[PDB]
């Protein structure tokens, strides 16, 4: 309806509370396996932030799985950084992690993170 009011901080507050659920491991419904390392998350959040998880979990079959193993060439630290971004909007980009973060974001199909990593790499050349 046309006649609505909007709470400016609502989307951020919701994300904060989803991140708190993640940290307390409440209603997490998937374990993402990256090399030997394990990451518990919510399928909904993963889908909302990644082109790859949107595709996996829209699939009738793969969506009922509690474990998802990622390509062995995926750096765990790179995935951990991107998983923290999904739930907080903050990306921990450092000189020593930008290559692994960009490679991981391309794989996860996270367009904005890819574009940003490109601009930051171009600046250092």
């Amino acid at each position: 309806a046309d006649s609505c009011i909007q709470f400016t901080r609502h989307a951020s507050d919701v994300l904060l509370n989803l991140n708190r659920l993640r940290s307390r491991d409440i209603l997490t419904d998937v374990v993402i396996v990256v090399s030997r390392e394990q990451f518990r998350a919510h399928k909904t959040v993963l889908m909302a932030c990644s082109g790859l998880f949107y595709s996996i979990f829209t699939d009738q079959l793969k969506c009922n799985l509690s474990v998802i193993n990622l390509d062995p060439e995926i750096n765990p630290e790179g995935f951990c950084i991107l998983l923290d971004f999904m739930y907080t909007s903050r990306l921990n980009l450092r000189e020593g992690n930008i290559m692994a973060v960009m490679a991981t974001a391309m794989y996860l199909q996270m367009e904005h993170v890819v574009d940003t990593c490109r601009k930051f790499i171009k600046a250092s050349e």
């Binding site: 790859l52 996996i56 998802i68 193993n69 990622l70 390509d71 062995p72």
Partner: peptide
């Protein structure tokens, strides 16, 4: 094992 390629 299997992975997501």
């Amino acid at each position: 094992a299997w992975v997501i390629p």
